[PDB]
Amino acid sequence: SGSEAYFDNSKYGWKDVYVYAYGTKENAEWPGELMTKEDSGLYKASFASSFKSEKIIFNNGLEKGNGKEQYPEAAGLSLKAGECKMLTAEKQWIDYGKPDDHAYGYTLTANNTAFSTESLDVKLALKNADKGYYSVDGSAKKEFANGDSVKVGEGKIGNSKVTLTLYATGADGVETEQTYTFKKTFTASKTTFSAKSDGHTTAPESGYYGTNPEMQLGKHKTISVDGDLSDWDSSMIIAQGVANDDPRVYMPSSMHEQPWDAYALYSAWDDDNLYFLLEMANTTYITSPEDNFAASNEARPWRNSIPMYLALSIDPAKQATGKAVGTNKDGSVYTNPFVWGCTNGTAKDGGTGFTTHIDTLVAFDSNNSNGGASIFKADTQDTDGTYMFNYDTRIPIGVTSFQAQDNKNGFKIKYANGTKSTSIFGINAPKGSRVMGDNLDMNSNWVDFFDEGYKNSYGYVYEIAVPLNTLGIDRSYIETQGIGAMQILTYGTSGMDTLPHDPSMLDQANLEYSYDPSTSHEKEDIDNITVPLARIGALLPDTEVNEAPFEVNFGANLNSGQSAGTPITLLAESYHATGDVTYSFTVNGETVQNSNTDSCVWTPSADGTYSIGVVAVDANGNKAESTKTFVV
Ligand SMILES: OC[C@H]1O[C@@H]2O[C@H]3[C@H](O)[C@@H](O)[C@@H](O[C@H]4[C@H](O)[C@@H](O)[C@@H](O[C@H]5[C@H](O)[C@@H](O)[C@@H](O[C@H]6[C@H](O)[C@@H](O)[C@@H](O[C@H]7[C@H](O)[C@@H](O)[C@@H](O[C@H]1[C@H](O)[C@H]2O)O[C@@H]7CO)O[C@@H]6CO)O[C@@H]5CO)O[C@@H]4CO)O[C@@H]3CO
Ligand SMILES: [Ca+2]
Ligand SMILES: [Ca+2]
Ligand SMILES: [Ca+2]
Ligand SMILES: [Ca+2]
Numbered sequence: 001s002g003s004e005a006y007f008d009n010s011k012y013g014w015k016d017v018y019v020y021a022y023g024t025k026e027n028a029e030w031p032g033e034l035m036t037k038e039d040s041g042l043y044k045a046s047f048a049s050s051f052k053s054e055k056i057i058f059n060n061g062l063e064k065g066n067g068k069e070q071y072p073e074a075a076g077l078s079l080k081a082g083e084c085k086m087l088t089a090e091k092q093w094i095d096y097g098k099p100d101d102h103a104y105g106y107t108l109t110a111n112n113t114a115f116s117t118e119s120l121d122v123k124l125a126l127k128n129a130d131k132g133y134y135s136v137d138g139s140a141k142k143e144f145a146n147g148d149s150v151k152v153g154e155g156k157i158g159n160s161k162v163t164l165t166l167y168a169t170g171a172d173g174v175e176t177e178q179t180y181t182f183k184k185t186f187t188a189s190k191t192t193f194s195a196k197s198d199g200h201t202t203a204p205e206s207g208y209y210g211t212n213p214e215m216q217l218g219k220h221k222t223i224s225v226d227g228d229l230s231d232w233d234s235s236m237i238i239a240q241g242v243a244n245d246d247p248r249v250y251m252p253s254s255m256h257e258q259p260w261d262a263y264a265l266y267s268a269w270d271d272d273n274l275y276f277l278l279e280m281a282n283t284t285y286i287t288s289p290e291d292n293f294a295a296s297n298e299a300r301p302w303r304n305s306i307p308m309y310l311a312l313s314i315d316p317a318k319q320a321t322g323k324a325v326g327t328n329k330d331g332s333v334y335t336n337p338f339v340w341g342c343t344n345g346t347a348k349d350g351g352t353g354f355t356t357h358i359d360t361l362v363a364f365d366s367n368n369s370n371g372g373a374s375i376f377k378a379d380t381q382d383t384d385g386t387y388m389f390n391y392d393t394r395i396p397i398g399v400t401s402f403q404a405q406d407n408k409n410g411f412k413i414k415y416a417n418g419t420k421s422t423s424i425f426g427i428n429a430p431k432g433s434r435v436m437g438d439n440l441d442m443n444s445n446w447v448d449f450f451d452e453g454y455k456n457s458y459g460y461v462y463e464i465a466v467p468l469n470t471l472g473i474d475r476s477y478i479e480t481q482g483i484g485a486m487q488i489l490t491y492g493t494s495g496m497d498t499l500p501h502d503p504s505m506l507d508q509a510n511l512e513y514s515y516d517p518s519t520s521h522e523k524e525d526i527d528n529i530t531v532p533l534a535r536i537g538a539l540l541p542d543t544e545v546n547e548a549p550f551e552v553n554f555g556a557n558l559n560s561g562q563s564a565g566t567p568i569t570l571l572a573e574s575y576h577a578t579g580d581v582t583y584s585f586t587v588n589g590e591t592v593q594n595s596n597t598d599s600c601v602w603t604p605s606a607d608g609t610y611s612i613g614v615v616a617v618d619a620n621g622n623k624a625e626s627t628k629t630f631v632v
Contacts, residue, residue, distance in 0.1 A: 324376070
């Protein structure tokens with residue numbers, strides 16, 4: 001009954017090992033309880049059935065200043081009733097069979113680990129036995145002993161999962177099995193670009209993120225601002241974000257808070273308006289449905305009035321820091337650090353400044369009830385040569401009554417539940433377990449939430465029209481010089497998420513909010529934008545484009561290690577190809593007949609170590625090849 005935690009002390013070398021457990025119950029005040037050294041060398045602790053969901057911290061029991069050591073430093077390792085886990089010498093937190101007396105095979109790499117190498121050398125081990133067997137992707141069972149290796153992913157096409165089952169029998173005669181899953185990832189090169197003249201100092205975020213993906217700069221089209229999405233399509237996305245990267249996810253337990261999760265920004269223009277579609281996600285339904293408010297439409301962004309901004313760069317030469325200027329009735333000049341801040345019932349610090357060049361802020365609000373919504377122009381130079389947003393010349397775009405939704409000067413905004421994208425990509429790691437930078441690691445636990453129960457109605461959309469005559473531009477300007485744009489989401493003051501995504505949205509995500517340390521300091525800190533804006537209409541003139549080359553993702557549908565006579569499907573995928581792609585599959589250099597398809601079925605006759613390959617050629621003669629190992 002209960003749960004068990006084991007600790008490998010062979011590297012830490014602590015005289016006494018303590019374990020501190022918190023969550024459903026606290027085992028004891030820090031430093032916790034003494035673990036028991038076993039003759040295996042491992043240290044062991046047990047927790048009763050009452051300790052249903054715990055976070056575990058190991059430590060040497062010593063005080064600050066007298067040699068205190070602990071691991072992890074903040075967020076404990078997850079352990080639930082019914083589990084038996086071990087912290088290895090390499091500091092992997094792994095399943096170690098189950099909390100009973102049976103034998104089990106286990107891996108020294110944590111279950112559900114993703115990897116981008118061609119294989120992952122996963123070491124195998126046995127608990128309460130000394131021989132086991134393994135089956136990988138349905139292979140015949142093959143014996144193994146402690147220390148042996150399995151090349152997980154060997155031979156396989158990228159973006160496939162690998163199943164690995166370990167079999168053992170203990171002294172009690174009970175045959176057990178432990179099934180593991182690993183993901184071999186593949187990431188195609190993406191065409192990306194930037195220009196020095198915009199003052200940006202951080203490269204556009206990539207991976208799942210993208211600024212002007214596939215060189216999409218928006219489209220010339222008339223949009224109907226009405227909350228219906230049939231007038232948009234995926235080709236019009238100028239900034240691709242990800243789901244579940246809003247700051248709350250980096251706190252130990254902040255999934256109860258309303259998300260501010262930007263997903264994608266689309267743009268179009270005609271001769272009258274500049275148009276935008278903003279998609280926001282709410283994955284709480286899937287990640288933490290126990291948090292009733294956040295996993296419900298009580299989380300809709302128009303529940304309360306929260307500032308939202310479209311930062312635009314019309315004149316590319318101007319740099320506006322965010323500072324604002326105005327005049328008093330007596331002619332005296334004043335400045336504020338941001339156009340809106342500690343303003344009318346927001347009594348919190350925070351804002352978003354700009355290094356990347358902008359000169360215009362469309363300052364609006366999430367339920368379109370702020371009669372002060374305005375287009376601010378950075379039309380006044382400060383002493384340092386930067387420009388300040390001018391209260392005196394702002395263009396009012398606010399409603400006269402919330403009920404009426406009658407925005408001034410032709411500004412149009414509609415919001416609704418809905419989702420335009422048919423994929424919602426983000427990280428689905430357990431709550432509390434997120435780490436800094438993990439949104440840029442392709443081996444984090446990325447999912448398409450539509451494969452995990454997401455529904456269109458979970459998300460939120462805003463459709464917006466900004467009249468060109470409020471921006472000092474026309475369609476010719478957009479199509480010939482272009483402009484830049486970024487959407488900013490707040491939770492009142494400071495930024496929380498942006499499109500394009502900027503790392504200042506997360507640089508302090510794991511720090512405590514002044515008024516409530518359960519939630520994120522990102523709600524109140526000072527952010528500063530350093531990535532490129534998304535271009536609309538045309539690239540900046542000094543843009544350097546980094547073109548992704550033609551490339552192939554190739555391999556088997558089954559892990560290396562299959563039995564003779566098993567049909568193995570060799571698959572090939574192409575990226576950045578021109579025209580038709582022809583694929584030539586080979587095994588030890590000998591061709592396999594594939595028709596003119598992207599797949600071939602190879603049935604190995606005899607044992608051996610085969611070199612499987614593909615050569616791909618497109619209609620402009622670009623060539624890509626891949627060669628992999630497959631063992632029978
Ligand atoms: O207690 C478990 C803790 O023990 C060890 O931490 C030392 C620590 O090094 C000392 O500084 C001191 O802690 C002081 C704090 O310095 C002081 O600020 C205050 O702490 C309060 C917090 O300020 C307040 O936010 C709240 O804390 C929450 C917290 O926000 C949650 O995230 C959660 O904290 C967990 C930690 O994340 C986790 O690492 C672990 O902490 C260990 C720590 O690793 C170790 O070095 O467990 C906690 C869960 O208990 O929950 C807490 C509480 O809800 O409340 C605390 C009030 O305690 O006071 C503490 C005195 O404890 O002393 C501890 C040794 O106890
Ligand atoms: Ca529409
Ligand atoms: Ca997001
Ligand atoms: Ca920040
Ligand atoms: Ca912030």
